[PDB]
Design a protein around this ligand. Structure first.
Ligand SMILES: *[C@@H]1O[C@H](CO)[C@@H](O[C@@H]2O[C@H](CO)[C@@H](O)[C@H](O)[C@H]2NC(C)=O)[C@H](O)[C@H]1NC(C)=O
Ligand SMILES: *[C@@H]1O[C@H](CO)[C@@H](O)[C@H](O)[C@H]1NC(C)=O
Lengths: 842, 140
């Protein structure tokens, strides 16, 4: 350590040099990535949610991009000749309503004039006048085709005078007498209005407004956020409007300011832990600086662009880690004082090294290896993190000992009383009660085991919508209501599968930004003419006609072809199927522009796609349609087996074709499914990654093995129970949680490790004795670290977001409970079962 | 299916990098960017100067329109601007934006016209008025 000793000494010596120079390097890279790189912003989150690099990535990618490559440009074109030479609808905004006393059908009057009130309250707004669009060229605020309006309208009165008492009656009469007089459509219009839940006892009301649906009405979103419109009987229960990703940004903006809060919390806790709030400044600004530093690593250095906001969470992540070495250190300081400066520093630092190093290392190891995912924002997240972590690491290591030295070169009682009593009562509660906690813990451990695995498996979601807010939100109120109604349906859009040959299938998109996909190629083992291949075409077409999921006019083009062929003359006349290639493509596009300009004109996709190689023609490639016995759903295994057997037979026929013709592939909307498989696979994968990582480390330092065993088991059951805690609050699966999981390892590890180390480091080799040493000399800083972490987490909670509050949950649970775990369970284990006298060391 | 007044496609900031994007500077006869601007002598259209991408979308729209309207044709109400009428910022200043209407100038028609606009392959649209519609295209 000689030069290392000189190095410790230089720390002992000449602070301000580094102090200032590193300040300099900081602000340098800071403002570099500040100014050169622009400030990434989020129009919306629904980004990088693909899985490129997948086989399906190849598929979807060539598919989509070819399609954006079809005919709007390029010689790829539809018809081979085209080469040669006031009733409403959803598009107006709308409210969902109800009556909340007597809880009856809204078919009655009381709620009707309750409405009249609500209406005159509603359109009363001038900001509304702003977007009112008073149509009719009259400056007349175009009228609401509303219900009391409907009523006074087929009345000859003004709305709210509709005199329900019998009006209502005769109307309901019309409605049952209604089913498809026919006054204009009001029947069918207000059919669109509400749901199947009347044939009576409509639960809800509903508003349209002759107004625009956009992001443009934000001010009025606010202006009705001000007013409840629920006066006595009612509730504006679900307002459906396109202003979402906007509030999204604005509320992130809210919450960051709200977050500096828990920051200052931990700051004060520390200062008072020393009464030196100089070091609190040191710490907080070191924090924000390592942040900007790793930024410049991100945007400027590897020069990256797409900064998915979710990475924000690193913040409320890192906040819990940076505070631990703190109390780890001060304690050694005070003690060694209780037992010139250069050597004292050098020792206490030889004694902190392993702790701080190993901790940060496992953490950022998890975050980094996040990068092996199949996903965009994931790699974003892990990479960003790993950097931020390793920063704070070096930050303390070097920036900080100067903090100490200088705080010196400068140069309540209740609390020491309290902490004395603390260690004391704890030590006793241990020494007296031996297996109580032990058996209790083992019980609950296997408990959460059966909890998670056997019965209530982590079953996935199928309604995706990727909800955002509190599951209770008017926007999210509307989340459930739709298909109850009419204007809701895709009868269902049956799975319409498609197959292709004549293009290649890859995605050379830049795997980071979601706006890089590349350029599509062309599969050219694919002769568009050769008979044996033609004849496999036609036996192929034959083959699907035989299926039940074969579900049944450009389809199987060959038919329109040979019609035009056998269609006699007055070259392309009176002809059969197997024939020339050149005469073939010579008569074909003629018959094709024919079927085109015919009144058939099927707006369609399957079939050919052309090029100028008349001017010379050809087809580049071409495709086939089929419908499915099945239609839309977000379920998993149905679609799974569907595709599986389908593609199976796809091969069963493919290999049969002349390899001329095995240049193709098969489509559907599995991407959803693509996720709901690949997600879990890749998740488990990375989990095992960080697992084996922390494994290697434990085996590295605390060489005797019983140690890491017991720790592993502690923390594994912590995993189990924290997960089944999420279960007790009952989640569907998304990536976010796979992520936080992965981190759990490098999170919990450190407590157990500090313990196993101090004891392995103690000069004693007995259970109780070396144990008590480690007690006195390890206990608290651990508590303070988990404490800051819980501060940050638990303070995100009474907030607006799934992400943030979700995350506070994750934090608090994992940290605190893994604590209790290794904080008494393993404590018992080696209260009684430590390796004494050179036992099981390496 | 027919567009509606104040609609924005996509429902974003027209400058959203994939919809139309942020402006990249005005074009005047001195700026070398005018070297690449193109006027539409397309006589099935009524004026001309605009962008090569505006050109693409214009000409893929032109005849789908006539398929939408016989007797009425692609009328360019405003193509390229150099006399400072479209505010301190406009793609008309670089011949990319287009204020648009039919050769017959009929209000409630445009909703469907704008529709086929996208059907031609345009990048951004809006029934931004009864007097006219607006369309725009990404940076080439
Ligand atoms: C598929 O193969 C055939 C023959 O192997 C190709 O065509 C013939 O070559 C040209 C085509 O224009 C013409 O002379 C005749 O139609 C054929 N040759 C004769 C009759 O001697 C055809 O072009 C190939 N197609 C592709 C896409 O590779
Ligand atoms: C006006 O009153 C007449 C007479 O009852 C009725 O037939 C008509 O439907 C009313 N107005 C409307 C718009 O229906």
């Amino acid at each position: 350590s000689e030069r290392m000793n000189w190095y410790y000494h230089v720390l002992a010596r000449r602070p301000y040099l580094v102090v200032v120079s590193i300040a300099v390097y900081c602000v340098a890279c800071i403002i570099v990535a500040l100014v050169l790189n622009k400030l990434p912003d989020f129009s919306d989150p629904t980004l990088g949610f693909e899985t490129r690099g997948t086989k399906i990535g190849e598929r979807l990618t060539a598919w989509y991009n070819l399609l954006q490559e079809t005919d709007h440009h390029g010689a790829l074109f539809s018809n081979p000749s085209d080469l040669w030479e006031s009733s409403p609808r959803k598009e107006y905004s709308h409210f969902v309503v109800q009556r909340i006393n007597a809880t009856d059908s809204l078919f009655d009057l009381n709620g009707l004039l309750a409405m009249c009130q609500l209406q005159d309250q509603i359109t009363e707004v001038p900001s509304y006048r702003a977007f009112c669009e008073p149509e009719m060229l009259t400056t007349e605020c175009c009228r609401p085709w509303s219900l009391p309006n409907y009523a006074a309208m087929l009345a000859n009165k003004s709305s709210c005078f509709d005199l329900t008492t019998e009006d209502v009656t005769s109307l309901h009469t019309l409605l049952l007498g209604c089913y498809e007089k026919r006054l204009n459509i009001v029947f069918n219009v207000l059919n669109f209005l509400t749901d199947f839940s009347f044939i009576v006892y409509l639960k809800y009301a509903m508003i349209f407004i002759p107004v625009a649906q956009s992001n443009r009405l934000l001010p009025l979103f606010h202006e009705w956020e001000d007013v409840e419109l629920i006066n006595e009987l009612v509730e504006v229960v679900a307002m459906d409007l396109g202003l979402e990703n906007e509030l999204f940004n604005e509320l992130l903006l809210t919450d960051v300011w709200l977050v500096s809060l828990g920051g200052t919390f931990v700051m004060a806790s520390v200062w008072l832990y020393t009464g030196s709030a100089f070091i609190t400044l040191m710490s907080c600004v070191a924090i924000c600086f390592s942040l900007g530093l790793a930024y410049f690593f991100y945007a400027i250095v590897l020069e990256f662009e797409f900064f998915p906001y979710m990475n924000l969470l690193a913040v409320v992540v890192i906040i819990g880690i940076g505070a631990d070495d703190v109390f780890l250190f001060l304690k050694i300081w005070h003690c060694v004082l209780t037992e010139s400066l250069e050597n004292i520093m050098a020792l206490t630092m030889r004694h902190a090294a392993a702790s701080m190093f190993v901790t940060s290392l496992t953490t950022a190891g998890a975050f980094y290896a996040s990068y092996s995912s199949s996903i965009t924002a994931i790699k974003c997240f892990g990479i960003f993190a790993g950097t931020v972590v390793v920063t704070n690491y070096l930050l303390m290591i070097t920036w900080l000992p100067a903090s100490v030295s200088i705080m010196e070169r400068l140069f309540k009682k209740s609390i020491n009383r309290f902490c004395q009593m603390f260690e004391e009562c704890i030590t006793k509660s241990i020494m007296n009660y031996a297996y109580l906690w032990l058996l209790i813990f083992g019980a609950l451990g296997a408990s959460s085991a059966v909890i998670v695995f056997w019965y209530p498996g982590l079953q996935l979601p199928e309604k995706s919508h990727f909800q955002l807010f509190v599951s209770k939100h008017p926007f999210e109120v509307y989340s459930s209501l739709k298909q109850q109604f009419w204007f809701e349906k895709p009868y269902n859009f049956k799975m319409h599968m498609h197959f292709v040959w004549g293009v290649q299938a890859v995605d050379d998109g830049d795997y980071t930004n979601p706006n890089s996909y590349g350029h599509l190629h062309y599969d050219n083992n694919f002769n568009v003419s050769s008979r044996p291949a033609q004849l496999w075409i036609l036996d192929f077409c034959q083959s699907v006609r035989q299926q039940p999921f074969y579900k049944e006019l450009p389809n199987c083009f060959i038919e329109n072809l040979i019609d035009y062929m056998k269609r006699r003359c007055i070259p392309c006349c009176d002809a059969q199927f197997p024939f020339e290639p050149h005469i073939f493509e010579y008569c074909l596009p003629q018959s094709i522009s024919n079927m085109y300009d015919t009144t058939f004109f099927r707006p369609g996709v399957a079939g050919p796609k052309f090029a100028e190689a008349f001017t010379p023609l050809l087809v580049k490639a071409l495709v086939i349609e089929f419908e499915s016995n099945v239609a839309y759903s977000t379920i998993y295994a149905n679609i799974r087996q569907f595709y599986e057997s389908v593609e199976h037979w796809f091969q069963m026929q493919l290999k049969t074709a002349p390899p001329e013709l095995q240049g193709g592939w098969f489509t559907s909307d599995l991407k959803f499914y693509n996720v709901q498989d690949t997600l879990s696979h890749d998740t488990f994968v990375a989990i095992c990654l960080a697992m084996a990582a922390s494994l290697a480390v434990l085996l590295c330092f605390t060489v005797n093995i019983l140690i890491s065993i017991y720790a592993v088991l502690t923390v594994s059951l912590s995993i189990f129970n924290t997960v089944a805690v999420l279960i007790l609050l009952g989640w569907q699966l998304n990536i976010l949680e796979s992520i936080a999981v992965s981190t759990a390892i490098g999170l919990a590890v450190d407590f157990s490790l500090h313990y196993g180390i101090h004891y392995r480091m103690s000069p004693v080799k007995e259970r109780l004795a070396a144990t008590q040493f480690v007690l006195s000399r390890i206990i608290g800083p651990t508590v303070m670290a988990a404490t800051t972490t819980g501060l940050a987490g638990g303070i995100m909670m009474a907030s607006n977001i799934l992400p943030y509050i979700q995350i506070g949950v994750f934090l608090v649970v994992v940290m605190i409970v893994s604590w209790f775990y290794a904080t008494f369970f393993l404590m018992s284990l080696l209260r009684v079962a430590g390796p004494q006298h050179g036992f099981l060391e390496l | 299916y027919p567009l509606v007044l104040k609609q924005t496609i996509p429902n974003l900031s027209e400058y959203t990098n994939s919809a139309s994007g942020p402006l990249e500077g005005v074009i005047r006869r001195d700026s070398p960017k005018f070297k690449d601007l193109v006027p539409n002598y397309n006589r099935d259209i009524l004026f001309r100067l605009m962008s090569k991408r505006c050109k693409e979308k214009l000409n893929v729209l032109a005849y789908s329109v006539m398929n939408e309207w016989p007797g009425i044709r692609l009328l360019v109400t405003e193509s390229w601007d150099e006399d400072y009428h479209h505010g301190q910022e406009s793609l008309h200043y670089e011949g990319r934006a287009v204020t648009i209407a039919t050769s017959d100038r009929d209000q409630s028609k445009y909703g469907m016209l704008a529709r086929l606009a996208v059907e031609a392959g345009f990048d951004w649209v809006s029934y931004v008025s009864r007097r006219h519609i607006y369309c725009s295209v990404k940076s080439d």
